[PDB]
PDB file of all heavy atoms in Angstrom:
ATOM      1  N   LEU A   1       0.805  -1.181  -0.033  1.00 17.52           N
ATOM      2  CA  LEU A   1      -0.010   0.008  -0.013  1.00 17.52           C
ATOM      3  C   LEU A   1       0.871   1.264   0.012  1.00 17.52           C
ATOM      4  O   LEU A   1       1.817   1.384   0.781  1.00 17.52           O
ATOM      5  CB  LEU A   1      -0.923   0.003   1.175  1.00 17.52           C
ATOM      6  CG  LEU A   1      -1.905   1.164   1.364  1.00 17.52           C
ATOM      7  CD1 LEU A   1      -2.830   1.342   0.161  1.00 17.52           C
ATOM      8  CD2 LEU A   1      -2.787   0.976   2.603  1.00 17.52           C
ATOM      9  N   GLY A   2       0.592   2.184  -0.895  1.00 16.07           N
ATOM     10  CA  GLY A   2       1.382   3.403  -1.012  1.00 16.07           C
ATOM     11  C   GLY A   2       0.828   4.424  -1.973  1.00 16.07           C
ATOM     12  O   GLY A   2      -0.286   4.268  -2.514  1.00 16.07           O
ATOM     13  N   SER A   3       1.615   5.496  -2.135  1.00 16.54           N
ATOM     14  CA  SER A   3       1.253   6.578  -3.010  1.00 16.54           C
ATOM     15  C   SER A   3       2.474   7.294  -3.524  1.00 16.54           C
ATOM     16  O   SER A   3       3.520   7.318  -2.899  1.00 16.54           O
ATOM     17  CB  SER A   3       0.343   7.562  -2.264  1.00 16.54           C
ATOM     18  OG  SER A   3       0.934   8.027  -1.091  1.00 16.54           O
ATOM     19  N   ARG A   4       2.390   7.932  -4.715  1.00 14.25           N
ATOM     20  CA  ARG A   4       3.365   8.852  -5.176  1.00 14.25           C
ATOM     21  C   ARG A   4       2.746  10.094  -5.763  1.00 14.25           C
ATOM     22  O   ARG A   4       1.573  10.057  -6.211  1.00 14.25           O
ATOM     23  CB  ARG A   4       4.349   8.202  -6.196  1.00 14.25           C
ATOM     24  CG  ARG A   4       3.697   7.581  -7.407  1.00 14.25           C
ATOM     25  CD  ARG A   4       4.440   7.805  -8.708  1.00 14.25           C
ATOM     26  NE  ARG A   4       3.438   7.820  -9.804  1.00 14.25           N
ATOM     27  CZ  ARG A   4       2.905   8.916 -10.212  1.00 14.25           C
ATOM     28  NH1 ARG A   4       3.219  10.110  -9.776  1.00 14.25           N
ATOM     29  NH2 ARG A   4       1.939   8.855 -11.176  1.00 14.25           N
ATOM     30  N   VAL A   5       3.485  11.141  -5.754  1.00 16.64           N
ATOM     31  CA  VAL A   5       3.047  12.484  -6.214  1.00 16.64           C
ATOM     32  C   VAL A   5       4.161  13.115  -7.043  1.00 16.64           C
ATOM     33  O   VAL A   5       5.355  13.083  -6.594  1.00 16.64           O
ATOM     34  CB  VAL A   5       2.660  13.420  -4.990  1.00 16.64           C
ATOM     35  CG1 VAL A   5       2.088  14.697  -5.499  1.00 16.64           C
ATOM     36  CG2 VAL A   5       1.702  12.750  -4.082  1.00 16.64           C
ATOM     37  N   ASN A   6       3.837  13.552  -8.229  1.00 14.91           N
ATOM     38  CA  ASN A   6       4.716  14.398  -9.039  1.00 14.91           C
ATOM     39  C   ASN A   6       3.980  15.702  -9.298  1.00 14.91           C
ATOM     40  O   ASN A   6       2.810  15.634  -9.680  1.00 14.91           O
ATOM     41  CB  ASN A   6       5.075  13.813 -10.387  1.00 14.91           C
ATOM     42  CG  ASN A   6       5.910  12.522 -10.236  1.00 14.91           C
ATOM     43  OD1 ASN A   6       6.172  11.833 -11.207  1.00 14.91           O
ATOM     44  ND2 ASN A   6       6.288  12.221  -8.994  1.00 14.91           N
ATOM     45  N   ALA A   7       4.682  16.828  -9.217  1.00 14.28           N
ATOM     46  CA  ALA A   7       4.020  18.096  -9.477  1.00 14.28           C
ATOM     47  C   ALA A   7       5.050  19.116  -9.918  1.00 14.28           C
ATOM     48  O   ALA A   7       6.229  18.954  -9.727  1.00 14.28           O
ATOM     49  CB  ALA A   7       3.271  18.581  -8.221  1.00 14.28           C
ATOM     50  N   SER A   8       4.542  20.140 -10.602  1.00 14.20           N
ATOM     51  CA  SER A   8       5.482  21.222 -11.068  1.00 14.20           C
ATOM     52  C   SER A   8       4.728  22.543 -11.147  1.00 14.20           C
ATOM     53  O   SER A   8       3.442  22.538 -11.270  1.00 14.20           O
ATOM     54  CB  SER A   8       6.078  20.842 -12.388  1.00 14.20           C
ATOM     55  OG  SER A   8       5.116  20.925 -13.422  1.00 14.20           O
ATOM     56  N   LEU A   9       5.497  23.578 -11.009  1.00 11.59           N
ATOM     57  CA  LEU A   9       4.928  24.941 -11.224  1.00 11.59           C
ATOM     58  C   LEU A   9       5.907  25.702 -12.085  1.00 11.59           C
ATOM     59  O   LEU A   9       7.136  25.532 -11.964  1.00 11.59           O
ATOM     60  CB  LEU A   9       4.718  25.620  -9.862  1.00 11.59           C
ATOM     61  CG  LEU A   9       3.797  24.972  -8.772  1.00 11.59           C
ATOM     62  CD1 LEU A   9       4.197  25.368  -7.411  1.00 11.59           C
ATOM     63  CD2 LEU A   9       2.351  25.341  -9.003  1.00 11.59           C
ATOM     64  N   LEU A  10       5.396  26.540 -12.979  1.00  9.26           N
ATOM     65  CA  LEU A  10       6.197  27.273 -13.895  1.00  9.26           C
ATOM     66  C   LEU A  10       5.687  28.680 -14.003  1.00  9.26           C
ATOM     67  O   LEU A  10       4.460  28.921 -14.071  1.00  9.26           O
ATOM     68  CB  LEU A  10       6.160  26.653 -15.297  1.00  9.26           C
ATOM     69  CG  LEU A  10       7.034  27.365 -16.357  1.00  9.26           C
ATOM     70  CD1 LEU A  10       8.252  26.583 -16.788  1.00  9.26           C
ATOM     71  CD2 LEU A  10       6.180  27.732 -17.601  1.00  9.26           C
ATOM     72  N   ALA A  11       6.580  29.663 -13.876  1.00  6.28           N
ATOM     73  CA  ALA A  11       6.210  31.076 -13.919  1.00  6.28           C
ATOM     74  C   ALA A  11       7.133  31.793 -14.908  1.00  6.28           C
ATOM     75  O   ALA A  11       8.370  31.594 -14.869  1.00  6.28           O
ATOM     76  CB  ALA A  11       6.299  31.711 -12.556  1.00  6.28           C
ATOM     77  N   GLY A  12       6.556  32.585 -15.731  1.00  2.00           N
ATOM     78  CA  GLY A  12       7.325  33.210 -16.875  1.00  2.00           C
ATOM     79  C   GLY A  12       6.779  34.528 -17.256  1.00  2.00           C
ATOM     80  O   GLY A  12       5.743  35.051 -16.811  1.00  2.00           O
ATOM     81  N   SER A  13       7.608  35.158 -18.132  1.00  2.00           N
ATOM     82  CA  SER A  13       7.238  36.421 -18.825  1.00  2.00           C
ATOM     83  C   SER A  13       5.806  36.340 -19.390  1.00  2.00           C
ATOM     84  O   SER A  13       5.345  35.210 -19.707  1.00  2.00           O
ATOM     85  CB  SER A  13       8.232  36.636 -19.978  1.00  2.00           C
ATOM     86  OG  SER A  13       9.516  36.962 -19.518  1.00  2.00           O
ATOM     87  N   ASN A  14       5.201  37.456 -19.554  1.00  3.95           N
ATOM     88  CA  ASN A  14       3.911  37.581 -20.200  1.00  3.95           C
ATOM     89  C   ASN A  14       2.857  36.739 -19.537  1.00  3.95           C
ATOM     90  O   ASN A  14       2.009  36.035 -20.201  1.00  3.95           O
ATOM     91  CB  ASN A  14       4.001  37.179 -21.721  1.00  3.95           C
ATOM     92  CG  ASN A  14       5.015  38.008 -22.474  1.00  3.95           C
ATOM     93  OD1 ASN A  14       5.819  37.463 -23.269  1.00  3.95           O
ATOM     94  ND2 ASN A  14       4.921  39.329 -22.327  1.00  3.95           N
ATOM     95  N   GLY A  15       2.829  36.718 -18.213  1.00  4.50           N
ATOM     96  CA  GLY A  15       1.807  36.016 -17.465  1.00  4.50           C
ATOM     97  C   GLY A  15       1.809  34.529 -17.683  1.00  4.50           C
ATOM     98  O   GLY A  15       0.742  33.890 -17.624  1.00  4.50           O
ATOM     99  N   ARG A  16       2.950  33.924 -17.914  1.00  3.11           N
ATOM    100  CA  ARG A  16       3.023  32.478 -18.064  1.00  3.11           C
ATOM    101  C   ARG A  16       2.888  31.775 -16.761  1.00  3.11           C
ATOM    102  O   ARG A  16       3.834  31.860 -15.912  1.00  3.11           O
ATOM    103  CB  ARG A  16       4.350  32.073 -18.808  1.00  3.11           C
ATOM    104  CG  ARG A  16       4.506  30.525 -18.985  1.00  3.11           C
ATOM    105  CD  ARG A  16       3.477  29.913 -19.925  1.00  3.11           C
ATOM    106  NE  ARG A  16       3.573  28.480 -19.977  1.00  3.11           N
ATOM    107  CZ  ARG A  16       4.264  27.748 -20.855  1.00  3.11           C
ATOM    108  NH1 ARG A  16       4.919  28.377 -21.877  1.00  3.11           N
ATOM    109  NH2 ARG A  16       4.310  26.425 -20.846  1.00  3.11           N
ATOM    110  N   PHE A  17       1.817  31.046 -16.538  1.00  4.31           N
ATOM    111  CA  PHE A  17       1.685  30.263 -15.282  1.00  4.31           C
ATOM    112  C   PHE A  17       1.188  28.840 -15.634  1.00  4.31           C
ATOM    113  O   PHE A  17       0.215  28.679 -16.316  1.00  4.31           O
ATOM    114  CB  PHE A  17       0.771  30.963 -14.314  1.00  4.31           C
ATOM    115  CG  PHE A  17       0.929  30.494 -12.910  1.00  4.31           C
ATOM    116  CD1 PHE A  17       2.157  30.659 -12.254  1.00  4.31           C
ATOM    117  CD2 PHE A  17      -0.091  29.801 -12.202  1.00  4.31           C
ATOM    118  CE1 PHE A  17       2.379  30.207 -10.924  1.00  4.31           C
ATOM    119  CE2 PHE A  17       0.090  29.327 -10.918  1.00  4.31           C
ATOM    120  CZ  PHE A  17       1.326  29.513 -10.271  1.00  4.31           C
ATOM    121  N   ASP A  18       1.988  27.831 -15.250  1.00  6.23           N
ATOM    122  CA  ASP A  18       1.626  26.420 -15.447  1.00  6.23           C
ATOM    123  C   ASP A  18       1.648  25.640 -14.129  1.00  6.23           C
ATOM    124  O   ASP A  18       2.532  25.886 -13.223  1.00  6.23           O
ATOM    125  CB  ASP A  18       2.591  25.704 -16.373  1.00  6.23           C
ATOM    126  CG  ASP A  18       2.491  26.137 -17.823  1.00  6.23           C
ATOM    127  OD1 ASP A  18       1.863  27.175 -18.100  1.00  6.23           O
ATOM    128  OD2 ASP A  18       3.053  25.438 -18.644  1.00  6.23           O
ATOM    129  N   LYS A  19       0.750  24.685 -14.044  1.00  3.61           N
ATOM    130  CA  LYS A  19       0.453  23.931 -12.847  1.00  3.61           C
ATOM    131  C   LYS A  19       0.196  22.463 -13.206  1.00  3.61           C
ATOM    132  O   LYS A  19      -0.691  22.191 -14.056  1.00  3.61           O
ATOM    133  CB  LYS A  19      -0.815  24.521 -12.186  1.00  3.61           C
ATOM    134  CG  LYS A  19      -1.053  24.341 -10.755  1.00  3.61           C
ATOM    135  CD  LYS A  19      -2.444  24.794 -10.465  1.00  3.61           C
ATOM    136  CE  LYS A  19      -2.685  26.278 -10.814  1.00  3.61           C
ATOM    137  NZ  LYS A  19      -3.985  26.812 -10.248  1.00  3.61           N
ATOM    138  N   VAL A  20       1.036  21.513 -12.725  1.00  3.48           N
ATOM    139  CA  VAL A  20       0.904  20.075 -13.033  1.00  3.48           C
ATOM    140  C   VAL A  20       0.842  19.227 -11.806  1.00  3.48           C
ATOM    141  O   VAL A  20       1.565  19.512 -10.839  1.00  3.48           O
ATOM    142  CB  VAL A  20       2.087  19.617 -13.965  1.00  3.48           C
ATOM    143  CG1 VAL A  20       1.975  18.106 -14.268  1.00  3.48           C
ATOM    144  CG2 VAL A  20       2.125  20.396 -15.261  1.00  3.48           C
ATOM    145  N   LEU A  21      -0.028  18.259 -11.825  1.00  6.02           N
ATOM    146  CA  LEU A  21      -0.169  17.304 -10.696  1.00  6.02           C
ATOM    147  C   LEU A  21      -0.289  15.877 -11.250  1.00  6.02           C
ATOM    148  O   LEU A  21      -1.098  15.640 -12.145  1.00  6.02           O
ATOM    149  CB  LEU A  21      -1.406  17.638  -9.850  1.00  6.02           C
ATOM    150  CG  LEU A  21      -1.568  16.766  -8.646  1.00  6.02           C
ATOM    151  CD1 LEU A  21      -0.553  17.103  -7.534  1.00  6.02           C
ATOM    152  CD2 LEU A  21      -2.985  16.878  -8.069  1.00  6.02           C
ATOM    153  N   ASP A  22       0.474  14.952 -10.680  1.00  6.92           N
ATOM    154  CA  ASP A  22       0.447  13.556 -11.088  1.00  6.92           C
ATOM    155  C   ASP A  22       0.510  12.792  -9.778  1.00  6.92           C
ATOM    156  O   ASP A  22       1.590  12.567  -9.200  1.00  6.92           O
ATOM    157  CB  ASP A  22       1.592  13.213 -11.998  1.00  6.92           C
ATOM    158  CG  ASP A  22       1.510  11.825 -12.643  1.00  6.92           C
ATOM    159  OD1 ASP A  22       0.466  11.190 -12.472  1.00  6.92           O
ATOM    160  OD2 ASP A  22       2.479  11.417 -13.280  1.00  6.92           O
ATOM    161  N   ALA A  23      -0.643  12.326  -9.291  1.00  7.22           N
ATOM    162  CA  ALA A  23      -0.731  11.565  -8.052  1.00  7.22           C
ATOM    163  C   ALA A  23      -1.270  10.156  -8.289  1.00  7.22           C
ATOM    164  O   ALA A  23      -2.145   9.993  -9.135  1.00  7.22           O
ATOM    165  CB  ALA A  23      -1.650  12.322  -7.029  1.00  7.22           C
ATOM    166  N   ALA A  24      -0.758   9.193  -7.571  1.00  7.85           N
ATOM    167  CA  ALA A  24      -1.286   7.852  -7.646  1.00  7.85           C
ATOM    168  C   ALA A  24      -1.261   7.207  -6.290  1.00  7.85           C
ATOM    169  O   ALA A  24      -0.428   7.539  -5.437  1.00  7.85           O
ATOM    170  CB  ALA A  24      -0.595   6.976  -8.667  1.00  7.85           C
TER     171      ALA A  24
END
């Protein structure tokens, strides 16, 4: 029994905002 989480955030010029979630 277990879990893993991958995630990322990205911030950039010209209002670039990215959000990633990978959970299991």
